[PDB]
């Protein structure tokens, strides 16, 4: 996260770190959506142009964390992956359309003060909150600059951007399964996700029912916190039939 701030303890208890087993390294962010299911970006797991194609035994998920690098004894929980499900229409060749993946954990994770699932939007949630100008929150342990690494989870709040502005900011083709967020150059404020933050959640707190909803997943960007560029996010609600299909077919 570029130009964010340190998270508070327990501020994002659904935050998940995808951790490469060996060599030990942050791969990506993710989020906890139930006691056995973790949501992330497909490109965290599969991106052939960069020779990326992870399988279940290559990774671990670390839940309940705050520190980036420490093993937070008696707080974090580390889970193994039972199975990865990537959206079958994930378009890695062009624009990461349908950039979404689910990971089923081998065992249920116990909820605690530091570990708790986020809600997923329904149609009305999305209609109500996924509006230009409305802000969401992105969290992660990725790079602090396009060109160090944070000691603790970082957070930044960013506004959803009008779709024509998003479109006009890039040569990449945008789809209805994406949205963009970030401040405009004239807005003076800054912030973006960056390398390492992929797959993490873009969350919004419903003013109707006081609950946090994951509206987006950190997807692609051109650089980080560049003026006139915006980060792109997978539109979770637009992919909810798939999420539900998977969990209903493979859930316990």
């Amino acid at each position: 996260i570029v130009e964010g701030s340190d998270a508070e303890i327990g501020m994002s208890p659904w935050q998940v770190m995808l951790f490469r087993k060996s060599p030990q390294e942050l791969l990506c962010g993710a989020s906890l959506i139930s006691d056995r299911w973790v949501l992330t970006a497909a490109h965290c797991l599969l991106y052939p142009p960069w020779d990326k194609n992870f399988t279940e035994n290559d990774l671990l998920v670390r839940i309940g964390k705050h520190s980036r690098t420490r093993y937070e004894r008696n707080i974090e929980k580390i889970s193994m992956l039972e199975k990865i499900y990537i959206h079958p229409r994930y378009n890695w060749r062009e624009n990461l359309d349908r950039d979404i993946a689910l990971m089923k954990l081998k065992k249920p994770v116990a909820f605690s003060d530091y570990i708790h699932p986020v809600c997923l939007p329904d149609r009305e949630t999305a209609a109500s909150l996924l509006q230009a100008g409305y802000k969401g929150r992105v969290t992660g342990w990725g790079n602090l600059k396009e060109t160090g690494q944070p000691s603790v989870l970082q957070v930044v709040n960013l506004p959803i951007v009008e779709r024509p502005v998003c479109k006009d900011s890039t040569r990449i083709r945008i789809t209805d399964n994406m949205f963009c967020a970030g401040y405009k150059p004239d807005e003076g404020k800054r912030g973006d996700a960056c390398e390492g933050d992929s797959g993490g959640p873009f969350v919004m707190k419903s003013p109707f029912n006081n609950r946090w909803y994951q509206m987006g997943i950190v997807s692609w960007g051109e650089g980080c916190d560049r003026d006139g560029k915006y980060g792109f996010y997978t539109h979770v609600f637009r992919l909810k039939k798939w999420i539900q299909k998977v969990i209903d077919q493979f859930g316990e």
Binding site: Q24, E25, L60, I78
Partner: peptide
């Protein structure tokens, strides 16, 4: 840079 995690998880 990352602290080692317990054996149990690897």
């Amino acid at each position: 840079d990352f602290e080692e995690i317990p054996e149990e998880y690897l």
